[PDB]
């Protein structure tokens, strides 16, 4: 029934998922004309097709298109984002310039694809939800994370409200015609406040005890368990569900699938490998070297360093500059050489388009 | 073949067009994937129907999403409009889209033709930025767009520049798939420039006994007859012919339109009813009243008033200003009961949401 | 001392306002360097200077640089309009900037008392985004920013929320160091819930007879009297107090300003008179005619008509491409000959970068 | 006379610099109004300062504010900029809140000055750059470059019309009221083609003998003595002259000021160290080393990399993702772990604002 609204949906996309709203609501909302959106359509079907056939994918955070780009380069299979719909389209804009240059150049396709998917963060109730799916549709987004948190520390939302939340956004898929992903993110183990105990399944991790803030909102009782009883709530609702977490832990990832797949059994899941986290410190090389594969095994099949592209930039700049200052031509002659030797790797950047653009007009 | 390459082409479309590439040069600059662009697509398609089924279609210059929308709402078929334009293209469609789904929502049918008029875009440095603009104005949704042959007194560029600008929109038109219109706009009826003198075509209008200018120009004879020149060489390679007029004229049009038409029988042509001209002062009421249909009989098929929103907006809002600073409340009450009074004629202006969040809230 | 703080601040600007932060709090947010706001500054103290010595400052709301440009041209002394807020002021200050420039090139004096009318503006989550939209608008070069206490039927925040709103937005200019206006919008009128009853001032008007709503908000007893308190309760953090209405009625305007000066005697108050309100059908000419003086002599100092501009630019468009489809160019050069009757009065949209060229040209 | 029109001008400001226009002109074209732009002032008076006094300042090309922002921290003195004013905007923000950071943390300031001057490229004729100019001064840059080519190969402009330009953005600096800082670059080095050989000071360095191109360019000798003439024709319109070289070379820069110097003694130099160039394959490391002293003192006092950060950026994140690929995490720990090592050297990214702000409005 939904399947024809969105006709580039994959055999089982909907399998388990259940919507508020009907085919008639989404026939009534859509318009009279049919709007193709060609990389959200490829984006979320390939994304629908990794998570489903790999071990796990996994993703590094790209504060700009070049950076998603070397990404794609360097072989990694999709790109999170965390002005995101803009980036989103900043972002395949500058992947589909590396295909074209490719093709233009005579050049064979030198990955996968060059359209990775993008799985953005969505950051108002139902209506904006409903609105900025629509927009990272439009921009080419693969899939996009909504949480549960509003705008000491973090606010939870009742768990009714942000099901609406979900809902809205895959009203906004389905009026739009593409099987976009929908993660739903908890921000329960670490969220120490709450806007409302409307919800009685809320009620029992509010810590009733501590009163209200002086600004009205409720306490509540963080940790694992409030994330499992929340992500068993929007398990119907999402595509991966996703517990954000500070302290990354093998044991606890463990703790939270194996309830979660109680409830919903083979239910895919999405993990941040916290980057404010001190690895080294914590864990061991082995269990550092192996700790994403074993992620994947319990069913975190899009995992993820949020803020990547921030280290990765901020770092690469201050050593840069800083030997710069003091060795001027030195230290970018460390870089230079850096770049030339990465070239067997498949770094390009050292090593056209609009040459044979000129030709062709010619 | 083209028409593999623009699936949504018509029959036809291609008779007498003219490219400098080949199908080949579209693949390999086009990449390894194909991007729908809906709208683009669709707007081209009607224009083109539009120009060949009416005795002509008649535009205004729109400055926002609102004045087009109040165009088609009040039957125009087609919107004009002069990296700003493609914004502002982008918008415009936006807002059709929006109406289009209000009306849509409430399954009354559509009070319109249809809300995506078509929209004709002035691209106002070189061939390769007539290809980007025009890639940026088919991803917008816009359905023809138009490239003028003055350097941005007026300069002329050589005859043979200028079709390449215009081969550069072709082959971009090309790239993106679709079949989007080319408009080609000569101002050589009032400048007496010419950057070289380069083009064979060009040559027998320069003054060489008059040197080069200080600025290294070539003077020029001005006037109808290198605007016919120009033309008939721009002809196969646009899909209507513009000469840029100061002084709006029915004979000088027929003179040109019959030039153009010994050279191409049946080709469509353009014109500009310049906002400028004082047209009560230097026409007689019959002629102002016959105007454009006089005009559309010799084939001028997309006829325009430029600054039209532009005239319209300032002086509305004097007025109104006026009254308020007079009056205050009562300047106000009197445009709203012109509002009331014009809702007998389809005015609006005086839900979706609503449904939206019904579909949400089930 | 806040005085220091914030140089270009007339006498006694301050009066009456309370700040829950220190001039220290100030200079720790600031930084090191101190960077100018000139159009902010001289909007800020043009608009302080017309509310205390015009009987009425009224205005229209704007929507485009041009309308707002006209509104001062016909002799209006302040603009309204309701991210893309400060950027629509941004532009506003431009085109108003390039008409002063293109009067002064001109040598023959300026038609207006100055082209730098001020602009207030509408800051439509919580305190910090209030501090950063109030930033972003007087870099703009905005002279007011009004802040409502409904959350975005209507659901109120409670008035300790919305007085940390107000005060954020002070912090915000005494940072920037301007003296920008602050108006407090009330909500209350029409508003049947609320947030939280946390506050004690807003649990008098609170139903605890009925339950919460199922998303968990306090059901309120709305009309006059929270307004009232609301009202009186915000005082000291704003500089003109703003009650919103459906319903224009002077006999409640009346009723609102005696309770609100009982209390804040001489408190500036500023009124949206109602474009949605059917003016005609529910008041006689007279109430008309009358009803901004009347307002102005209760202490309404600043009054506008929100969506002014909206309507306006609708109609107008509306009813000029109507007569174009109907006749073509007769109905446009009905609209010139328009425009030219209005140049008695004027009216100039019917020169600088000439006088630019020139003085590069030496 | 124009030192009063300019009222931040340090003494000696503008020794030896000719302007085309007048005081008069200025007051003409400035508005009846003063608007201050201090981040211009300031960094136009540092950048002016800091040529004057250091041995030479070394930049680096960012793309982004966090890239200027670490740059800065580093201990840097100015930004190269290579959506340039936007991006300005941007770099001025970013910088602002390290500042404010800072100072809301109560800590001292870490710099000189967080705000280091940002010199950038302007990408028309005359009214182009002085358009642009403006927008730059409004950004908050310290200086602006103007290039004499013409946005096979690159072609250049007449010596005449690119002086044009360079009165041009004066004339806007003097409107404006800022010392900004004029950079005129020359691209005669490498480029084989000219617009016009109207001006009798490009006809020596004409190759006559190889005809006009087939779009009517002339072809020209291009290396070190075009860019010898044609510097010494900028200087008295400019306050720095800039050779762009593709091949570094001490000798042909000691050539190039010498020859500059023999008719504008002590002129200020600006050199771009080619990104492009192989600089260990053809120069030794002592040569490397000390390659930006050297140039210093011949009086290079402005030296850059135009795309460092994008060559920092593009293998700083292909290598991460390479890492990330095969070895997942451990990669990521690798790059923790040495952001960790640098907070000594001072680093912070790894080791607030928003919290001093709450405190202040609570």
Redo the contacts between chains.
């Keep these: 029934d939904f399947y024809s609204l969105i006709p580039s949906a994959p055999k089982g996309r909907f399998d388990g998922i259940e919507r508020?709203?009907?085919a008639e609501?989404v026939k009534?909302?859509?318009?009279?004309?049919?709007?193709?959106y060609?990389?959200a359509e490829?984006g979320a079907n390939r994304l629908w097709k990794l998570i489903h056939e790999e071990d796990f994918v996994?993703a590094?955070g790209?504060?700009?298109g070049?950076?998603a780009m070397?990404?794609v380069?360097?072989?990694?299979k999709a790109i999170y984002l965390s002005a995101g719909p803009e980036l989103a389209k900043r972002i395949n804009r500058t992947l589909?310039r590396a295909?074209?240059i490719?093709?233009?150049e005579?050049k064979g396709?030198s990955v996968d694809?060059?359209?990775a998917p993008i799985v953005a963060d969505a950051e108002?109730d139902?209506?904006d939800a409903?609105e900025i799916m629509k927009a990272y549709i439009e921009a080419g987004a693969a899939g996009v994370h909504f949480e549960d948190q509003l705008?000491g520390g973090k606010v939870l939302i009742?768990t009714?409200?942000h099901i609406?939340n979900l809902?809205?956004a895959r009203?906004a898929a389905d009026v739009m015609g593409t099987p976009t992903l929908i993660v739903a993110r908890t921000d329960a183990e670490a969220a120490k406040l709450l806007?409302?105990?409307?919800d009685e399944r809320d009620q029992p991790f509010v810590d009733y005890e501590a009163g209200?803030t002086?600004?009205?909102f409720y306490q509540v009782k963080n940790g694992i368990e409030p994330c499992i009883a929340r992500a068993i709530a929007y398990a119907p609702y999402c595509d991966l569900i996703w517990m954000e977490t500070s302290k990354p832990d093998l044991a606890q990832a463990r703790r939270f699938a194996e309830a979660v797949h109680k409830a919903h059994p083979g239910k895919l899941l999405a993990y941040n490998?916290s980057?404010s986290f001190?690895?080294?410190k914590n864990l061991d090389?082995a269990t550092?070297?192996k700790?994403?594969?074993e992620l994947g095994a319990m069913g975190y099949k899009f995992q993820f360093?949020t803020l990547?592209?921030?280290?990765?930039?901020?770092?690469?700049?201050?050593?840069?500059?800083?030997g710069?200052?003091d060795?001027?031509?030195?230290a970018?002659?460390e870089?230079?050489?850096?770049?030339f030797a990465?070239e067997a790797?498949?770094?390009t950047?050292?090593k056209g388009?609009?040459d044979?653009?000129?030709?062709?007009?010619?």
């Design positions: 508020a709203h009907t609501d009534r909302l859509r318009g009279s004309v049919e709007i193709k060609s990389l490829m996994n590094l790209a504060l700009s070049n950076q070397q990404m380069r360097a072989g990694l589909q295909d074209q490719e093709t233009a005579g396709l694809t060059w359209f108002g139902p209506l409903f705008a009742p009714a409200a609406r809902n809205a009203l806007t409302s105990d409307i209200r002086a600004e009205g490998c980057p001190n690895w080294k090389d550092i070297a700790f994403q594969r360093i990547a592209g921030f280290h990765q930039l901020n770092y690469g700049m201050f050593e840069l500059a800083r710069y200052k060795r001027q031509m030195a970018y002659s870089l230079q050489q850096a770049e990465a790797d498949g770094y950047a050292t388009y609009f044979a653009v000129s030709l062709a007009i010619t």
